[model samples]
Target: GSSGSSGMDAILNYRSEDTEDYYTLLGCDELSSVEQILAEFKVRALECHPDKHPENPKAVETFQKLQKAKEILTNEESRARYDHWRRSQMSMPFQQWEALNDSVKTSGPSSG
Candidate 1:
């Protein structure tokens, strides 16, 4: 699993040039409306929010990252940059990409 810093870094340091698949980071690969972003953020926020998981410090950090990802992806410009970065990230490790693609296929359409 990617570390807390990596997860949070995805959000905190988000830039259009830095990501190729912002949607994938959010567990999706299609364009998302602001409403969709908010809904997803809420779901992730509730799941990983520090307050909800007193026993897991990492969860707290994850929740913050989720918030940051939401913030960046919801914005038009940032979303574009994130999309680019996502594409770049995809170019690495063929096996990893294949597994991710398989997971996406099996995951079906995502909804918040």
Candidate 2:
């Protein structure tokens, strides 16, 4: 999950169409170490737990997004992939696409 703040920030910019993204969900807009990021994930999980909003699908959706952010940000492999996809998207500075595609083809999982 220590995929580098640059990648995450790029991802946030691309995905949200100018507002914010994952780190914003965890209340982070500053540089943080892996442990700090993980800590935020745990705190956010309790607040957005599905159990607390059983009848609210919107809340469930929010929770899912939170889970997704936490999951990727806490895993080396997944975060690498995410960071790659983001860079792949970022690399294409020649299109007028509205948000990049969710999946980006890659030769293989990136290392480091």
Candidate 3:
């Protein structure tokens, strides 16, 4: 048995940098039009192309993240759901958001 052992890279790093949510990753605001999202995705996808940036592994991850962002934003239903959550994420505390989410889901359920 080897006396020396190295585990996988596991270091918790936190910084003050702004977080990159889907909309931010796509470089678009939640209010951005579908057309705008499409256009931005086209441009960003090209810019983040993994093949185009062989020197930077980060490009692959960024490109994939952007792809998911586009997929969600382009679909009307997904976009609506994303917008609802995103709005809550920005507007209030998590507890309040959870309460709001529950209320929305229930919305006076139970058929007579």
Candidate 4:
């Protein structure tokens, strides 16, 4: 068999991000508006963009999530939908019971 590998990408590779989450991801507080999100995007662009982590593909995936956060937050309609969904999630006792900032990192490596 010539097939060297057929394994799929890591399960942790894909994830959803909230607009406000980007605020924290980029080291800001929960941003209430799109402008703040975009500002933070510009601030952290070099660190999270995939190009910066070319050799570290996994970390590059994190960068992409950073991009995704900006994309959804920048659009009014998408932000509305994202807000509604996040609100719904917050209402769930079990979901909200756990810390929203669960990825609180003492070192490196984290979440969305």
Top model by TM-score, which number? 3
Where does candidate 4 have its weakest 10-residue lDDT segment? Answer: 93-102
lDDT of 4 by residue, 1-112 (tens): 5657677865775565664464456554335567777777776776666666687768765667677767756777655555665666765432233334344344333545
What lDDT does the true structure give each of the candidates?
0.62, 0.60, 0.73, 0.59
Model 1 lDDT at residue 43: 84
How would you encode candidate 1's per-residue C-alpha lDDT over 1-112 as one tens digit per residue?
6655334444465454444333544664445678887887788678777887788887875675677667777787756655555568756533344436447554423422
lDDT of 3 by residue, 17-98 (tens): 4776777877677678889998888897997798987998888877887887788788887667666776556666333444
Judged by lDDT, which candidate is best? 3
Candidate 2 colliding pairs: none
Window of ten residues with lowest summed lDDT in model 1: 93-102
TM-score of each: 0.51, 0.51, 0.57, 0.48
Model 3 residue 47 CA deviation (Å) reads 1.3
- RMSD values for the candidates in order, in angstroms, are 17.9, 15.6, 14.6, 17.1
